[PDB]
């Protein structure tokens, strides 16, 4: 019969090898029990044990001492013998019966302590021992003569803490050792084979890579007679440490992305754009490899005005995305064959039976006129995006048309299905216990369909967004975003050793459209930044850029507390346009300023930050 004990937990390192968490080892004495060993039996061990170990402060309470004087049964007998007019109840009386003001040798007072500690253990439990820190002889003497203090043994326990660093948030947490195994999912684990008292990640990374992090568990079994009385504890095998884990993210860069966010947010908080803003989020990738460069964010409490840092924000919160999604939609055009190559449509106000016109930002000043898909992205035409929704539904626009909704349920799914190919509304496959997968309602109206066609309906996570543009920058091959780069062993000191196995990127699916369609998409994103039209939306991308950037900017509007029309200024982009090495999305919700969206501008400076970090040009 053997007892298990979690082993040194593995550690976590940023891209650079800077460490993120703390193991603090400390060898100590565990004491088992036994419905058998007994007051007397425990005293015997107490003294034997004090021959080894150090203890100055014995701030014993009286209630304790009482219990120790009563330890001799005779004693207890004789004590009760004296009380006048239920076991523990009558213990309760007898306990308080003896006036306790009575002497004990000062070294006395010390194994009375232990005894308290020893007694404190539940039957069959294995407890520890409020002691006085231990050297190496003191310790390894015990290593040898447990079997001479039937029960006792010394264990290596550990504290695990998280360092203050931008990534702290992501790391997650592990169960304390006083905690054990959190019932909730608790059972599922015993089935996977864990000792009950183990310590496991409760969330995020600590949980995600549990397999590999968990250090092989330490071991001891116990012997005893046909009568159950303890005979001695024993070590079959002491535990080792875990494997380690190196991240795709480099601190300094994540760090500097973050002030960039602060800088920009303060700007908007200053000039008042941000009064109603919940915050701002930004995520960066390698589009080809799916590695994460940084996930940054800033929560802003509207009540106290205070600003709190938030990185999980990327994977946990959802926003209406706005114009940043039109590609998805055009791409549903092509798959379902409503658009042919670079399709020409006519930009005109969209009006349905007895209801508000539906328009693009330019639409009413420019009257109606024709326009290519490439152009449609350039000027961010909703009409085109809505004429295309219509297409899927199988109808073609006439002014004032009644719409038969028979093809609706079918239509919304077709579109939605494409969005999901890009990562929008579908799981990313990120390496974490739980990404929220958007706000895609199944109960939806017709208005809902058409507004979904320009990203004013379904709600998306910032992490989803990055993936969607990353996919475009990859040529329609969606790669699962991962935060871990490689698993690494240990070195002689116990720090970052070296390569166990490098994690390779995993392809989620290819977006089925032609290359020539994909290139037609690429051209648009290119002209959203470099275009020379009075209508071009994102020349902001190109202002002061260190490399050629292609992106797509976004606004969606609305409601905003006791308000007030206001909008989101998200923006997705990648680069270099020629040979895309970084993909980014920035979401900046309920913005007040509505005039010049700082979403693109932010993403530019992110990219700029990165290339100033890791030059990407260099044919
Ligand atoms: Cl304004
Ligand atoms: Cl600017």
Swiss-Prot record:
<dbReference type="Pfam" id="PF00905">
    <property type="entry name" value="Transpeptidase"/>
</dbReference>
<dbReference type="InterPro" id="IPR012338">
    <property type="entry name" value="Beta-lactam/transpept-like"/>
</dbReference>
<dbReference type="GO" id="GO:0046677">
    <property type="term" value="P:response to antibiotic"/>
</dbReference>
<dbReference type="GO" id="GO:0008658">
    <property type="term" value="F:penicillin binding"/>
</dbReference>
<dbReference type="InterPro" id="IPR050515">
    <property type="entry name" value="Bact_Transpept/Beta-Lactamase"/>
</dbReference>
<keyword id="KW-1003">Cell membrane</keyword>
<dbReference type="GO" id="GO:0071555">
    <property type="term" value="P:cell wall organization"/>
</dbReference>
<comment type="similarity">
    <text>Belongs to the transpeptidase family.</text>
</comment>
<dbReference type="GO" id="GO:0071972">
    <property type="term" value="F:peptidoglycan L,D-transpeptidase activity"/>
</dbReference>
<feature type="active site" description="Acyl-ester intermediate">
    <location>
        <position position="323"/>
    </location>
</feature>
<feature type="region of interest" description="Transpeptidase domain">
    <location>
        <begin position="251"/>
        <end position="617"/>
    </location>
</feature>
<keyword id="KW-0573">Peptidoglycan synthesis</keyword>
<keyword id="KW-0133">Cell shape</keyword>
<keyword id="KW-0472">Membrane</keyword>
<comment type="subunit">
    <text>Interacts with MreC in the elongasome.</text>
</comment>
<comment type="function">
    <text>A transpeptidase that forms peptide cross-links between adjacent glycan strands in cell wall peptidoglycan (PG). Part of the elongasome machinery that synthesizes peripheral PG.</text>
</comment>
<dbReference type="InterPro" id="IPR036138">
    <property type="entry name" value="PBP_dimer_sf"/>
</dbReference>
<dbReference type="GO" id="GO:0008360">
    <property type="term" value="P:regulation of cell shape"/>
</dbReference>
<dbReference type="GO" id="GO:0009252">
    <property type="term" value="P:peptidoglycan biosynthetic process"/>
</dbReference>
<keyword id="KW-1133">Transmembrane helix</keyword>
<dbReference type="InterPro" id="IPR005311">
    <property type="entry name" value="PBP_dimer"/>
</dbReference>
<dbReference type="GO" id="GO:0005886">
    <property type="term" value="C:plasma membrane"/>
</dbReference>
<feature type="topological domain" description="Extracellular">
    <location>
        <begin position="1"/>
        <end position="617"/>
    </location>
</feature>
<keyword id="KW-0961">Cell wall biogenesis/degradation</keyword>
<keyword id="KW-0812">Transmembrane</keyword>
<dbReference type="InterPro" id="IPR001460">
    <property type="entry name" value="PCN-bd_Tpept"/>
</dbReference>
<keyword id="KW-0046">Antibiotic resistance</keyword>
<dbReference type="Pfam" id="PF03717">
    <property type="entry name" value="PBP_dimer"/>
</dbReference>
<dbReference type="InterPro" id="IPR047982">
    <property type="entry name" value="PBP2B"/>
</dbReference>
<protein>
    <recommendedName>
        <fullName>Penicillin-binding protein 2B</fullName>
    </recommendedName>
</protein>
């Amino acid at each position: 019969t053997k007892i298990t004990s979690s082993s040194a937990r593995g550690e976590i390192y940023d891209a650079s090898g800077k460490p993120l968490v703390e193991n603090t080892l400390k060898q100590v004495v565990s004491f088992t029990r036994s419905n058998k060993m007994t007051a007397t039996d425990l005293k015997e061990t107490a003294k034997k044990l004090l021959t080894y170990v150090s203890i100055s402060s014995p701030n014993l309470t009286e209630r304790q001492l009482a219990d120790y004087y009563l330890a001799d049964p005779e004693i207890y007998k004789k004590i009760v013998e004296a009380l006048p007019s239920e076991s523990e109840l009558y213990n309760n009386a007898v306990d308080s019966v003896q006036t306790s003001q009575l002497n004990y040798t000062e070294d006395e007072k010390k194994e009375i302590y232990l005894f308290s500690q020893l007694n404190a253990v539940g039957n069959f439990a294995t407890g520890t021992i409020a002691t006085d820190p231990l050297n190496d002889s003191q310790v390894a003497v015990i290593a040898s003569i447990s079997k001479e203090m039937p029960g006792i043994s010394i264990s290596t326990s550990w504290d695990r803490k998280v360092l203050e660093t931008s990534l702290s948030s992501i790391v997650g947490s592990v169960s304390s050792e006083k905690a054990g195994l959190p019932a909730e999912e608790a059972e599922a684990y015993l089935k996977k084979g864990y000792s009950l008292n183990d310590r496991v990640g409760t969330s995020y990374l600590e949980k995600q890579y549990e397999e590999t992090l968990q250090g092989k568990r330490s071991v001891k079994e116990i012997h005893l007679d046909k009568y159950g009385n303890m005979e001695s504890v024993d070590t079959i095998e002491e535990g080792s440490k875990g494997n380690n884990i190196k991240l795709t993210i480099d601190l300094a860069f994540q760090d500097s992305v973050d002030a960039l966010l602060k800088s920009y947010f303060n700007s908007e908080l200053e000039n008042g754009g941000a009064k109603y803003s919940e915050g701002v989020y930004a995520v960066a990738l390698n589009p080809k490899t799916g590695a994460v460069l940084s996930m940054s964010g800033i929560k802003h409490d509207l009540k106290t005005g205070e600003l709190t840092p938030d990185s999980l924000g990327t994977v946990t919160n959802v926003f209406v995305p706005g114009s940043v999604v039109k590609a998805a939609t055009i791409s549903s055009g092509w798959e379902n064959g409503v658009l042919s190559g670079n399709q020409t449509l006519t930009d005109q106000s969209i009006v349905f039976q007895g209801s508000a016109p539906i328009n693009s930002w330019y639409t009413q000043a420019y009257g109606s006129f024709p326009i290519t898909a490439v152009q449609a992205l350039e000027y961010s035409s909703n009409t085109y995006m809505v004429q295309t929704a219509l297409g899927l539904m199988g109808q073609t626009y006439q002014p004032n048309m009644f719409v038969g909704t028979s093809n609706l349920e079918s239509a919304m799914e077709k579109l939605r299905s494409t969005f999901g190919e890009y990562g929008l509304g579908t799981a990313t496959g990120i390496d974490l216990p739980d990404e929220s997968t958007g706000f895609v309602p199944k109960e939806y109206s017709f208005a809902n369909y058409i507004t979904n066609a320009f990203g004013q309906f379904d709600n998306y996570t910032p992490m989803q967004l990055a993936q969607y543009v990353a996919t475009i920058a990859n040529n329609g091959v969606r790669v699962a975003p991962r935060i871990v780069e490689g698993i690494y062993g240990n070195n002689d000191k116990g720090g970052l050793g070296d390569l166990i196995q490098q994690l390779q990127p995993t392809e989620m699916n290819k977006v089925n459209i032609s290359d020539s369609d994909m290139s037609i998409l690429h051209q648009g994103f290119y002209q959203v930044a470099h275009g020379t039209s009075g209508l071009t939306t994102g020349r902001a991308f190109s202002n002061g850029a260190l490399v050629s950037i292609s992106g797509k900017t976004g606004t969606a509007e609305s409601y905003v507390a006791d308000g007030q029309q206001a909008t989101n200024t998200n923006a997705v982009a990648y680069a270099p346009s020629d040979n895309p090495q970084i993909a980014v999305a920035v979401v900046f919700p309920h913005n007040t300023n509505l005039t010049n969206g700082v979403g693109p501008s932010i993403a530019r400076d992110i990219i700029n930050l990165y290339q100033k970090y890791h030059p990407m040009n260099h044919h």
